[PDB]
Design a binder for this molecule. Sequence first.
Ligand SMILES: *C(=O)[C@H](CCSC)NC=O
Lengths: 118, 55, 114, 123, 208
Amino acid sequence: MRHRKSGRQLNRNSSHRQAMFRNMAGSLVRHEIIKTTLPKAKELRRVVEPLITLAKTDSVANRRLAFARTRDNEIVAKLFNELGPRFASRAGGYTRILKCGFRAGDNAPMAYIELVDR
Amino acid sequence: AVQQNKPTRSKRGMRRSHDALTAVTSLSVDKTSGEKHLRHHITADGYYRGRKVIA
Amino acid sequence: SNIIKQLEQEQMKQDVPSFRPGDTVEVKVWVVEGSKKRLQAFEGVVIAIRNRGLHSAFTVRKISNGEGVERVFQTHSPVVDSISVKRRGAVRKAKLYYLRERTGKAARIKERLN
Amino acid sequence: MIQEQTMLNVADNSGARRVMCIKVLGGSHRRYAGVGDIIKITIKEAIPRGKVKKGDVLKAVVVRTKKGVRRPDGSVIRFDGNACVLLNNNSEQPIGTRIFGPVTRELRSEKFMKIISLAPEVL
Amino acid sequence: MIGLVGKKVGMTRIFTEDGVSIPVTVIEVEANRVTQVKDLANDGYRAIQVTTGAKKANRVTKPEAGHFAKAGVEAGRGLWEFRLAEGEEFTVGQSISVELFADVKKVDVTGTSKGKGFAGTVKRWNFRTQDATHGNSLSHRVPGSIGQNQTPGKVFKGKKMAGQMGNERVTVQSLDVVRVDAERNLLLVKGAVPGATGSDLIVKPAVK
RNA sequence: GAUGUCGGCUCAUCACAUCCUGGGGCUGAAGUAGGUCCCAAGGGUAUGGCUGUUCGCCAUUUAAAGUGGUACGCGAGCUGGGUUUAGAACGUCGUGAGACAGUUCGGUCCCUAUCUGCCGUGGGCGCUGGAGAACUGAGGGGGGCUGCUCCUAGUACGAGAGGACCGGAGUGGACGCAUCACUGGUGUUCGGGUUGUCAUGCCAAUGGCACUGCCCGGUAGCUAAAUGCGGAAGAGAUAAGUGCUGAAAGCAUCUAAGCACGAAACUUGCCCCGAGAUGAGUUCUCCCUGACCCUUUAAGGGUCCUGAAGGAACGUUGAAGACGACGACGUUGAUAGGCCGGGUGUGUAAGCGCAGCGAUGCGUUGAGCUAACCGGUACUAAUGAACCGUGAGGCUUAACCU
RNA sequence: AAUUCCUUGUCGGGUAAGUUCCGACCUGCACGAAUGGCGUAAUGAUGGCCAGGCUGUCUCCACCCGAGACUCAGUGAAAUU
RNA sequence: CACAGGUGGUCAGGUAGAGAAUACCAAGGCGCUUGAGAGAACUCGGGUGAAGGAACUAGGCAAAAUGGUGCCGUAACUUC
RNA sequence: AGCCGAGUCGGCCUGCGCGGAAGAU
Ligand SMILES: *C(=O)[C@H](CCSC)NC=O
C-alpha cells in the first residue's frame, strides 16, 4: 500500500535521484527551456520553484543556502540578479509544461518545460 | 510441466481473440494554422492553441 | 477540521504553567479509597514532552525505595489537580533517555537560572 | 508480560534471590501474566539459612513489571524490572514477613490485603 | 425503525468528571428529505426513499432532475431506502433530522471498509509461517499443502487462498450513543466504525 | 521401455463404536460425588525433559487433552535425523577374497503449468424502441466454545462431618471482524552530533565518498503488544423419554380413533453475496412525431434531409488499484502542483560584537530550517470542436372505449 | 567400553522433569598384552555433554531500502505431443 | 559464444596507517551494447524492532556478539 | 373377567409380515 504518500522512485536510489535533479535544475536555469520525459518534468517543478521563491530576498545567508542546494556560482548569480526581480510580483507558477510526441529509441512520452516569461 | 496433447488451431484463434489494436478516434485542428494534431499536444510546426511556442 | 477543533477547544485547561525537559516538577493527583478522596504527590525529573493539543502528555522519572519508576501523564485530564516547578535544568536535547543507564553522581543535572 | 523461562527478582524476605517461571495458570493456551496474576515457579538461587531452599516448586504473584499498567484516563506506570512475592502452594498466603519496594493499587482485593498493608508505598 | 445517512468526520475523546476517557467517533447528520413512498398496492412492500447533501446542477442528468422535480425537493448526492413497520407513516417532501435519536441508547453503523488490494494467506487468513533457517528452500510465506491424494483427486470449493482483501460492506453492532447535538447536526458514538475519513455511513437503532 | 516407501513442518476433509458441553431411564441413587445403559456430530479438544523416533515413561496445566478413514491424507509444497551405494574401525564367522533385521564416525533431494480443479478480476452477446437510477428475493455462504466469584442459602438433605436442584448478577481464557483517539514499533523523502580523506583560490562556511560512514531524536502512512464490538434471547416441527382420555379383550393398557409436553442436532431469527432466477422479475424519471425510388410484395433493398436522451475518448487525479475495473473534477472551476497563514519535529543558524594567551564561553535568540498534515488562494496545467448512439417501436386472441 | 544381545541393567551426581553425559559395581551374550596392554603434558576446520555473554532461532510477526515478478516499445528460445 | 573462469616477468606518487592490509585521492583509464513506467502477492540481497531470551531444532544450522596500544594481574596440571 | 346371562381357556401343524441391523467426497 502507498496511502497518502508523495514522491517518485524512478527505478533509482536516493543518492542518484538527488544528483540527477541537481544537474537538471542547473540546466533549466541556464537555458530557460529543456526537453525531457513527462514524469521527470512533473518532478522537477518541486525542486526548481522553491529556489526562485528563496531568491526574492537577497542576503548572505540566502546566497549560501542556494549554494548548498546547487553548487554553482553562475547559477546562484543568475538566480539572485535576474530571476527574482523578474518574478517579484507573481504568486507561484513560474514554469510551464507542454506535451510533445514519443521518443524514437524506446517510445517514451516527452515534454518541454520552460519559464513562463521566456 | 508440459502438455500431454497438442493444442489445435481453433484454440490458438480463441486465445488470440483479444489482441486487436485500437485506432485514434479523431484528431484536432489548430485555430491559427489549420494543422491536425493529437489532442493536448503541440503540432509539427510548433503551435499550440493558436500560439507559436517553439521556433 | 473546524468541527473537531471546536469540539476540542471547549475541554482544554487554561492554567498550565510552562516547563521544559530537564526541570524538576511536582504533580498532585486524586486518589480514591472507599468513599474518601485525597491528594497524593509525585516529584521528579521531566524527560519527555508531547505537544499535541488536547492530546498532550509528559513523562516523569524518579527513584523510590531503591527502585526506578516512570509515569506518563495526560496533560488535560481532571485526575491531575496541579503542577508545580521546583528547579530549572540546563540540557541540550529534547529527549533524555540516556539517563536510564546513569546512577548517582553520574546522573546530576546542572542548574539554568535563566 | 511474563511467560515461561522468564526470570524474576523477589520482593520479600523469605530467603530467595532469583526465580524462574514454569507455568502461567488460568485457562487453556494462556500466554502472558501481568500485575495481579498467579504463576508457578522453581527456585534458582537462595541465601544460606532462609525458609526456602534451591530447587523447590511453589506459587507466586506478580507485583512489578517493565511493561506496566494502564489507567482509566490513559496513563501508564512502568518499573525498571520484574519482581514477585512467594506464596504457599496450598493456602496461597505469603511466606515472608516484610515487603521491599513499591506496589500498585491493582492488588487491593480480599486476597492480597496483607501485602497492601505491609508495603512501604502504594502507587 | 427507520435510520439515517451521515458522513464520517473523525475520532476524538470525551473526559468525564470521575476521570474517565471515552474514545468517540464523530458523525455529521444533516436533514434527510423524503423522495418516494412505496406501498403494498403499487409496489408490493412498504418503504421510504431519502436523499441528503447537495449536488452541482451541471452534473445532474435529465432523468434524475425529473425524478427530483416530481417530489419537489432539491437535488442531493444519492438515494437510499428504508423499510417501514406497522403504524409508521410519512409524506413526500418531508424532512427528518438527527433529533430522531434523542432517546435511543445503542445503534448499528454500516459502511465500506478500507481496501488493501491483493493479499497473501498470512495476512488474509492468519496462516503460520514456516522456518526461516534450518535448510528451508524458497518456502517461507507460501501456503503449504492444498489437498489429498488420488482420493478425492481435486480441490474442494471454498478453500482459503490469496486474493483481494477489503473494500466491501461491513456492519458493526451495538454501540453506545454518547451524545446527540441538534443545533450543529452531530452524533457522537463510542468506539470505531468502518471506513475512511469522508465516507458515507448508515445509522440504525440496534436490532439485538 | 520406473506408481519416490519412516518420522517432523504447513494445510486439511469425512464417519460415529461420544473425550467435554446438551437431554434422559435404572441404581446396592439421603446430600456432595459416583456406577451402568439410551438419544445427540453444532462448536471445542495442552506446553515441556529424554530419545531419529510413531509409541512410551516422567514434570506441570485444562471443561476436556476422543477413536478411526482419506496411496498407514499431504516431497512437480518444505526438511533429510532414521532405512538403503562407494571411505574407515570394533566384536563375531571364514585359510581367504569378504560377510552380519550387531554397533560406530562421514556422506549432491531436478522441472518457466497446456488440460481438469480452486482463489480473485475483466471483455462479448442475450433478456424484443433506446437511456439513467432505486429495488423484490429463487438460491448460496459465514457464525454457533467455555471457566471462576457472588445472591437465593449455611436454606432443602443429613446423628454429625458436609452441602444442593431451579432462578438471577458480575468478571475472565481461546477465537473472529473493524479501527488509529490513547500506549508503542518502523519512518535510507525532516532536524542535529561526530571520525578519516578529497574539493569549492585562502580564513570562515559548505558539498561528495566510506553498509543511510557511524550514531541520537522524529511528521504523515502502514501497523500489535494498543481498544471498541460479537457467539444470543424468541418461534415452528421433533429424538430418547414422560403423560391424558379410551376400546379391541365387561377388567387393565401413552394408541388402534382423538389430545398435551419434550435437546447445543433440523427449519427460521443475526451478518455478507445474489435476476445469465434463459422461469433473464418490479417501480420512478427522460428522449426521438421528414420526403422519395425499385422489386421476386416482405419482420424486403436503396437515396436525400436529420443526429435526441445518453455514452465513450482525451486531460488533472484518489485513504481505488498487478493491468482492466471503481470514485472525484475539466474556466459557469479548488482536481493536481506551486504560493500565503498555522501546526508538528529538531533544539538557540549565519553574520556581527564582548571576555579569554588559547581550545571555548556569553548577547542579539527558543533562534534558523522544517516531507506525506489543517485552513485558504486561479499563479501554471485541465481547448472551441470532432466521434458512437436515430427518426414513435412484430403477429394472434380476450376484455373495455369510442 | 568406537566391543554388552537381554537393556532405557543397578547405585550416585547434575535438571521441575535426562533412552544422551560424568563416577562406580562385575552376571566380560562375544576385552587382553608389538594384526600390541594400561596411562600421558602439548596439539585438532575431529565425536559426545554442561555453563556465562548474545541475539527475529522461537512465542508471533510488523515496517522500510534496493533487484525481478506487472504494463508499453524492439528482438526472440525449450522439454513434450 | 564480444562466456561473472584460467594464465609467468618488470615498474611502485600523496594524507592517515606497523604495513604491498584498509579508506579517500594523483598520473592514467572507465559507466560493463536493450530501454521507459508503476510502486500488488511471492522469491532474491540488506537495515531497524515493544516484552521475553534457546521455550526452536536431529543439532544454537543461520544470525547476533568479541576485536587496538600501554600498564596492573593471572588457577589445576606439566615431558619444566 | 369384574364387582350377571353367552361363551372362555391353553397346547399342535401351517402361509405372509415385525425386532435382532454401526462408517468413512
Ligand atoms: C531395497 O534395498 C531398496 C528397494 C528400492 S525399491 C524402489 N533399495 C535400496 O537401495
